[PDB]
Amino acid sequence: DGTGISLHRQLRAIQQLARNVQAVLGAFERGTADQMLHVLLEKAPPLAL
């Protein structure tokens, strides 16, 4: 509506968006490393054996 109220809470929106997008992209950098050890775990046989 043009009122400053709409401005600030829009910042909060742009803010929260940037924070989740930031969070899910890094989920693939950890996903990978986790993906590894598990794929490393699926593949891996114990030492004892």
């Binding site: 509506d1 043009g2 009122t3 109220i5």
Partner: protein
């Protein structure tokens, strides 16, 4: 015999626009524009006598 039928005129009016401000009612009210009435919750005026 030569005949015709004619449109002898076309009339329109003017829709007239009144302003609350050119009125005497406007003395019975203080008017202010408050674009955030949407975002308000409870407004209050308080008096002392």
């Amino acid at each position: 015999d030569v005949e015709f039928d004619a449109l002898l005129g076309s009339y329109c009016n003017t829709l007239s626009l009144v302003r609350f401000l050119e009125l005497g009612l406007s003395v019975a009210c203080v008017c202010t524009k408050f674009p955030e009435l949407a975002y308000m919750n409870e407004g209050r005026v308080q008096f002392e006598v």
